Write an enzyme that holds these catalytic residues in place. Structure first.
Site, PDB file in Angstrom:
ATOM      1  CG  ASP A  19      -2.057  -0.993   1.133  1.00 41.68           C
ATOM      2  OD1 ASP A  19      -2.472  -1.356   0.017  1.00 41.68           O
ATOM      3  OD2 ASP A  19      -2.528  -1.415   2.245  1.00 41.68           O
ATOM      4  CE  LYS A  20       1.846   4.832   4.166  1.00 39.85           C
ATOM      5  NZ  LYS A  20       1.528   5.877   3.158  1.00 39.85           N
TER       6      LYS A  20
END
Ligand code: NA
Ligand code: NA
Ligand code: NA
Ligand code: NA
Lengths: 384, 380, 383, 382
Positions: A19-20
């Site tokens: 996600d990052k």
């Protein structure tokens, strides 16, 4: 009549969590467009899964940027450089589906609500649990990149649980969880020793929270065992799926809007930044120990339809939240164009915000962290 | 010193909003798999943009489901049935990147919330924002208001008192996609009557809606094209709409496309169940509960009850929390068993909120643990 | 013993057939790049399926082109502008997966390339492909100009001629036309409209009445309705109509696709050179029909192979081996010398991406020049 | 008037060439569907570029097959198992965009050609037969560890001097370009491939007499070939149609084979034309035979048939007379071809590299010379 100890938890992730990776790719494209055209309109979402990066959305820009090379270079910088670690910036799929076609009075570009928060319980005006979780995820990346702990890979997650007192304040560190990706040349027993010493013990001393870490701290390092593959491999990541890690770790309310891949005309981002700026100044001006502020907009209207100050009965100087809010309304211009101008947001400063939090970053010089409205707030309230 | 009135806002979106299209597609695939294989593991994310649906992730299932047809049928149900409205389920792209085996998880924090300020135990701003977005879809599908298209957003702002309670409706925003045959003025008359006025009566909040209400209908002009065309959507980008509209804190975890083995879903549902029972048991007017899990440990590593000084019965939040720990088994496996989660009930949750749904029969809305909590606290 | 009449068939498709959509997009991107940077290296493949265009490959260029807008505009020009016709350039998916990073210059690849020419038509083309292309171009024309209403972009044409014992066309036997259409019109209505405004018009426009006498089988939309067209339930790819693009099966083929390739790719530039060679052999009066193979090794400028065949139509008592010596004297088949002599570094290729690369009376293509006839005759010491 | 020697070329490619990766993936999907449901209707195209496989098209089947696992396993069998070699089946992207009595009409129009020649024991032209033997041997020496430090992608090409009668006379030039590890260079590869691929195949093929004197051998003539496969060379299904058939010796109708079930005449009618052409030659009616067939959508009987034997026709028969015998013996309605050749079996993945014709390593129904008796008997021959 029996009592339990209340235990509060926050988490953070490294730059190699899928996600990052998406947040960082989205903000790497934003910054590249801003560097060449500060007026760029950018709504770019990234999706990652096994072997794939898909970039989607809408830009309005006069700049040319080579998106696939930006993506591959960002994955290499993170450390996804081989099939052996689960993902290779040099050889992965990169697919782009971006559409390129179709002053303070300017109306909001969308409706929505946004919160900001500050507390004087840390030097950086952040809640202790998210502050510690971010320091642990930042340190886990540092020890890998600098070779302090060899044989680490990019993906990782931290989680801290504090005991809280009856007045809603942190009392003691209770539990620390760290999971890190690693080479198969090391095992969990080695990782436990290395991360206890070089991550957890180092961070407790670096944060000055020895007093909170006395006695029995429960530490779980890689509790599920081997963590060889990571990032997008056998998984999926999306832009805007770590919005609580990005903000206050669940201590503060959230309006729902993601930050990364959005230029500053998006109130989801700029008004959240303006609310951190407001909250931090409320606390720094000695009006409260903790402050949370909601703002809300209607599409096509410059002035917020709403503002909501809360200081959780930590208000000082006999002032109510309603009096503090009147001072905020006198001192701050919360029209989106006025936020962009006062905080000088049209600059390529966002890729740094895309991991380890947007707020309380003493490694960065972010304009929403300025406590430069203290004098004006106190004067609006007739305080010395 | 001068005072300002505190104004709190919440928002909702229709099922045609691109992010909610994604939540619905993800949960439609989840339900199709659970129908055939209750033990299915599902982690499916949907992305939409101009002309394309991309479904990504991982499934571990014995079930065969035809994903492209499920996606097409779901867009057509939402009302995206033509290039004219900007997206067509029959003719759009559908691309699937789902892994079905490896070939070569209980962690994080979750919050639940309840308040007795509404019969459904929800905060008024989000309860009203969801009633408006549900009613906006309804007036389109029923043809009560013609010339509407599926994409829309609603927003509600309430004045609050010094004690952090709602005092009166201040501002209502509705933005709706529509046919070019109609304009903002026409939508204003139609939506004030058939959506705003109708919902204020249906909700019984007339006394909160007296005097001057600011109504902003398509305040930024026409809204002909909507859905994914020039407005990309992803699963799990409406997590505050899905929950309590910003009244309650959130742990970051999205619900849609996740089977019940994922605590981001099951533990948030359990915390709604705990919070609603605390308030139904007359222990507090308002309750917020955080839970948290540590990988490899079944029982939660963290629990945190907050009732915002609305405590009743001379109980502290610490005392309420001891009663919760005695009454509720918060191991994920026990939550799944007690709430009977392995059923195809989730597509319905993917728009108009997961909580306080009077139209659905969701197990986490049961106030069936009140007697147990009061007995654990030695109350009558 | 019993005899059968030999029957030879060629086909063509409209610009709206999904394979030709891909060829057109690939060459529209190439043309846009060559327009601002004539030195552009381009290898771009297009894939179409329900709702989506995916453009893939590699480019080396100083030029900026907005590929999504190029794609949408090209689909609009072809006539895919609504979900009702099965595909809409305005609303379809567009995904891009493109990586962005003198005469003695070696070939960039190995490969074999064929060129052909025949003096049986003024454009030096076999009659079966010449007629199939005229029909497909006419089919497009009657839609765009509205001579025949209710037509949709996707169509296929097919022509079968009886052949004599010496392998020459004798007469038109069967014409097939399948066209996409509005559901308001039926097979019966298309059959009347297409016989008059397409089949009978073309026969006259090509001057082949002498070959279209007697009974001709005409099959117009024989399978039924054809309402949904283009990529919708019929995926397309760049380089999947290579026989349509060349001589419709009358000549041999090396397998290389043309569209989405800049002129540095021998698959394209050397096929173009072989057409130029084969046309000049026939124009110079050395044969009635000529087919020429050339082949290259990666990194080597001079071809490794050249093969002339004239099918016993050779004139002046010259063998194929003698004509080939003349070709080697006259033509420089190093790739760089082909690019230079035919001036290939221009945006002329989108025009080539449907209705054939050869024998195009509507275009002025450098490989159709009969400008080496004197040089071939002088090499053979012919007057 | 001077003479030049005519030089005819054909090429082949390994199973690691990005276009052949796409053919093999398309026919692996087809086989998996036919294994569970012989009536499966399949039109599956594969596209490969840096890090990604995209499978598109249309299936009508009662069968469930796991497409991503099939794709990854096939790339692993081919040898693409690392970012180091440029493509890894275990970690690459896979995206799927697939939408789900004998007078039975053709499903499409089109033209198809078949070819046979008695110049090799497999009835194939010598240039493509030798190119395929080289590409198969280049794969074999890598997979079996005969030559180390090879990687999957490679191409072969052979040029033969031809006589005035359009026959091969001498092998002139051999090209092999192979993907390889950085630890070896062109000079090492030239030594290794001359012995273990070129010389080995000239002996295996029994063509020593065509390979005397000076042969130009070009090994990795463009230098280093470290990355290969989809990385910088996008591949698509049906982009090696001349490698798949007769290497340019025969004419072609344009139709790709891979990813298509046998109800597609592009595949089944080309197979029928090989069968017809090989039986014409096996029957002793010609040394070389090329046959076109053509269909119209909605019609079972072909709209066209065209026999060419290039003046090699024997026994005083014309090609018009051979063609009448063909029409008497062969049922060329698609349903009849599918029935007589028993095509509804998972036999296609094996055809997706190294050619569809003259495959002595396979037992392909269209290679049967089971119709010579009926052809002779229809021409009133001994
Ligand atoms: Na308060
Ligand atoms: Na409290
Ligand atoms: Na000859
Ligand atoms: Na002949």
């Amino acid at each position: 009549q029996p009592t339990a100890v209340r235990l509060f938890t926050s988490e953070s992730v490294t730059e190699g969590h899928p996600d990052k990776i998406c947040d960082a790719i989205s903000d790497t494209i934003l910054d590249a467009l801003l560097e060449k055209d500060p007026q760029s309109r950018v709504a770019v979402e990234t999706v990652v899964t096994t072997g794939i990066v898909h970039v989607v959305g809408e830009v309005r820009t006069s700049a040319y940027v080579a998106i696939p090379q930006l993506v591959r270079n960002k994955l290499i910088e993170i450390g996804f450089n081989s099939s052996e670690v689960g993902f290779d910036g040099r050889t992965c799929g990169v697919s782009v589906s971006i559409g390129e076609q179709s002053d303070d009075r300017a109306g909001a570009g969308d409706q929505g609500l946004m919160f900001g928060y500050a507390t004087n319980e840390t030097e950086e005006y952040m809640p202790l649990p998210i502050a510690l979780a971010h320091r642990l995820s930042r340190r886990l990346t540092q020890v890998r990149k600098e070779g302090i702990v060899p044989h680490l890979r990019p993906d990782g997650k931290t989680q801290v649980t504090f005991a809280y007192d009856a007045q809603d304040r942190p009392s003691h560190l209770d539990t620390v969880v760290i999971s890190t990706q690693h080479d198969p040349e090391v095992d969990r027993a080695w990782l436990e020793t290395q991360l206890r010493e070089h991550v957890i013990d180092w961070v407790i001393k670096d944060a000055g929270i020895e007093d909170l870490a006395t006695g029995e701290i429960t530490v779980l390092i890689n509790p599920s065992g081997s963590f060889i593959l990571g990032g997008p491999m056998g998984d999926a990541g999306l832009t805007g799926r770590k919005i609580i890690v990005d903000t206050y770790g669940g201590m503060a309310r959230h309006g729902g809007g993601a930050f990364s891949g959005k230029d500053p005309s998006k109130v989801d981002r700029s008004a959240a930044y303006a609310m951190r700026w407001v909250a931090k100044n409320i606390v720094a001006a000695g009006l409260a120990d903790r402050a949370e502020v909601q703002v809300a907009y209607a599409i096509g209207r410059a002035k917020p339809v709403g503002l909501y100050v809360e200081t959780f009965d930590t208000n000082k100087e006999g002032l109510s939240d309603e009096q503090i809010q009147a001072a905020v309304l006198e001192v701050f211009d919360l029209r989106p164009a006025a936020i962009i101008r006062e905080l000088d947001l049209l600059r390529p400063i966002y890729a740094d915000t895309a991991a380890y939090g947007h707020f309380g970053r003493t490694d960065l010089d972010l304009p929403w962290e300025a406590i430069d409205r203290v004098d004006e707030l106190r004067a609006a309230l007739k305080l010395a």
